[PDB]
Structures are given as C-alpha cells and as structure tokens.
Design a protein around this ligand. Sequence first.
Ligand code: HEM
Ligand SMILES: CC1(C)[C@@H]2CC[C@@]1(C)C(=O)C2
Ligand SMILES: [K+]
Length: 405
Amino acid sequence: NLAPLPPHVPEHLVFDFDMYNPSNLSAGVQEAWAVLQESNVPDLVWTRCNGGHWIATRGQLIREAYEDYRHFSSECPFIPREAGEAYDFIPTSMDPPEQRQFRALANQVVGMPVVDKLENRIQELACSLIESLRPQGQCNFTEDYAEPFPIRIFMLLAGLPEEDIPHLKYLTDQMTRPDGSMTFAEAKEALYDYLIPIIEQRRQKPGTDAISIVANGQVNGRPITSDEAKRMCGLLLVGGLDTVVNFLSFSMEFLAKSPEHRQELIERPERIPAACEELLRRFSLVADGRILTSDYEFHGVQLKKGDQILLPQMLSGLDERENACPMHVDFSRQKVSHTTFGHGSHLXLGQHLARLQIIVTLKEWLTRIPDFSIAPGAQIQHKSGIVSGVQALPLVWDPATTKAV
Ligand code: HEM
Ligand SMILES: CC1(C)[C@@H]2CC[C@@]1(C)C(=O)C2
Ligand SMILES: [K+]
C-alpha cells in the first residue's frame, strides 16, 4: 500500500508509481516507466509507494541530480529505505572524495585491459553457445544464452565454480527484483557469507582472478581492508550477474519482433556498434537514486533532509526532450542521447565489457540464426526493479534458414 503523505509534500505532486510492479507493465517495462513522461505529469513527483520517495521524470533533472553529490548522496542509493540503508557496496555507496580511490582498483578488475584480455574467450563462448542451439530450431533465450554467456565469463574472471551460479544469481536478483522471501539485507548478508572465506583464503594465497586482485589491492597507496574487499567484490558479482544478462533479452526480444532491423544489420554489419548504442537508449533498464544531505529546493520543489529521490537512468533517453520519437528504434539516429550507464562520478565501470558483450552477441547470433521469432502465442512478460528484466523469451526458427561454421 501507500505510506501517508509527509507534511512537506503537496498533493498536486503525488503520482503513485510502484517501481517494483508498475501499473502498465503488460505494455512493456520501458513503456510502463514512460507513463511518468506524459504531458500532465510534473518533472518531479512523489510516490507513496515503497515507503515514499520522489522521482525525477526528465533527463535534465536526472542529469543535474547525478552531478550534484553534495545534495544528492549515494550513501543510501536504493528504494525502499531499508534497502538503501543496508546497501554498502563500494564504490557505489560512497560519495566523492572518498569514493574515487576505489574506482581505480575496480577498474583493474573489470576495465578495458581486462576486457581486451578476455575478448577471445568471450567471442569463443558466444559462438559455442549459439552453434549448440542453432540446429534445435528453438530456445529459452534467458536460460540458454542471456544468462550463461555473461555469467560464465564473470565466474571465469572471478575464479568461482560454475556450479555456484544458481545460488549467486538467486541472491543477486533479490537485491534488484525481490520475490519477497528475502530483504535486501538478508540477501546481502548471504552474499557476504559466501565471499568472506574466499577473500581471506585469497589474501593468504593470492591467485590471478578478480577476487585475488581486489582482495590484495591497494587503495591510494595503502592496503584494502577485508571488509572493503568484500563490499567491492559483492558489487562486481551483482554487475556480473544482473546487468548484461537482462539487457540481452530486451534486445533479442526486439530483434525477434522486427525482421527489418535484423535485415539492416545482416546487410550492413558496420552498423552494429551504432545499433548497440540505439538499443542501450531504447531498452535502458536501470533505476537507482540518491538521498538528500539537506533541505534543498530543486526545480521549485521543496526537498527535506533524508528524503529519497529515485533518479531513473532508464528515463533520460526515453524523454522526448532528449530524443524525438523516443519509442522508435532508429540505428541511423543522428544524436543518441541517454544515461543508460549512469551519470556523474558513479558512471559505469563495466561498460566496455558490456558493449563487447552486446556487440559480439548481435554479430555471432545474426551470423548463424538470421531468421527467428517468438515461439507461437508466447506473451513476453517483463519485470521491474533497480534493474528490470524479461521473465522468459522462448524463440523459434527453422534450422534450414541457418548457417554453421
Ligand atoms: C547493460 C549493462 C549495464 C548497465 C546498463 C549498467 C549500469 C550502471 C549504472 C546506471 C551505474 C551507476 C549507479 C549509480 O550511479 O548509483 C553503474 C555503475 C557501476 N557498474 Fe554498471 N551497468 C552495466 C553493466 C555492468 C557490468 C557488466 C559490470 C561488471 C561488473 C558493471 C559494474 C559496475 C560498477 C563496479 C559500478 C560502480 C561504479 C561507481 O559507483 O563508482 N556494470 N552501472
Ligand atoms: C545500479 C547498478 C546496475 C550499478 C551496478 C550494479 C547495480 C545494481 C548497482 O548496485 C550499481
Ligand atoms: K547505506
């Protein structure tokens, strides 16, 4: 239900949006969030859902808030409040100045140089998975590709058993789209329960995996503590297991449904990177936020100290004030404007990994399985949260239309 309105919040700003179960979910998750950008809805509304919080509805406000960490702190970045208070991943839960020393370490485990070195494993895995599926004439896209392809790479990188995937993924999802059986805090603590012994053990006898590197790293010239290492490793796991995994299904769903757009990429493969980018805008999927460090007036609205404000990364590129005809996918879009990977000082650090992962998928999939569709009569269900996703994507094709090598 709906938390009672705080004395400081005027009635005309109330729009009761639930980010975990939005009213128009059936029409598509990006579409359900876009109801916040209809003509009679303010730039800045208060929802009585999920304990009560603000939502900036437009790119300009979202951008401004992300830049202004002095008023909009990451210390409590998740809705509901219990989740933001329990949230303590590094660097995400820290503001500058302290946040920054940690980014460099994180970079050492997921940035460009790590990515260049993983690139042949990544390509190899995409081809392997796709060739395996090709002759079946069908798949459950989420289980058979969108999960194993990003996730086996991350486990490879982190030096963790593939048999640990289901427990890890379960826990991760409880932190972005809870089924209601675990609080944020309960899942985080269970994530820590798993990491703690491994981090110590990798501090005792370091390897060349990501956990060893974080575990034995330095932070602006001094050693990382055990507790900090854990709070960093947890964030990497979440990003490894619940970002690209969901993005791929939005993109594949779209491609299953538009043969023209497939044909465009088959016919002009040089368009793939630009296509990646337009799809990143279109099927944007993250929505975290910040907390007010003081009473502050912002675009003519009075915010109180401790108020939570959701600043949906998803919404900036769907905003018609940033991109005309924003629901329309155009790979030749002259100026693709979005905040898919964030804005300000917390700007995504796995974005090179993610764009490689996307681009490789587009290429290797259309190469082998050019014609394909949604299974007969399947109604694709989406799910909303910190990171939205797709419940299931059953796909079909005629193997005769496909090409191996
Ligand atoms: C489609 C893919 C992805 C999207 C849309 C995405 C989105 C984002 C967003 C919106 C933020 C900012 C959070 C905030 O400002 O509070 C962020 C930060 C971050 N992301 Fe990504 N992400 C993606 C893939 C990945 C991957 C694969 C990783 C690998 C681990 C990753 C690692 C991180 C890390 C470590 C941060 C924290 C940086 C900081 O707080 O300074 N992301 N990401
Ligand atoms: C919003 C995010 C996608 C960003 C990386 C993982 C995530 C869930 C975070 O906790 C920070
Ligand atoms: K916190």
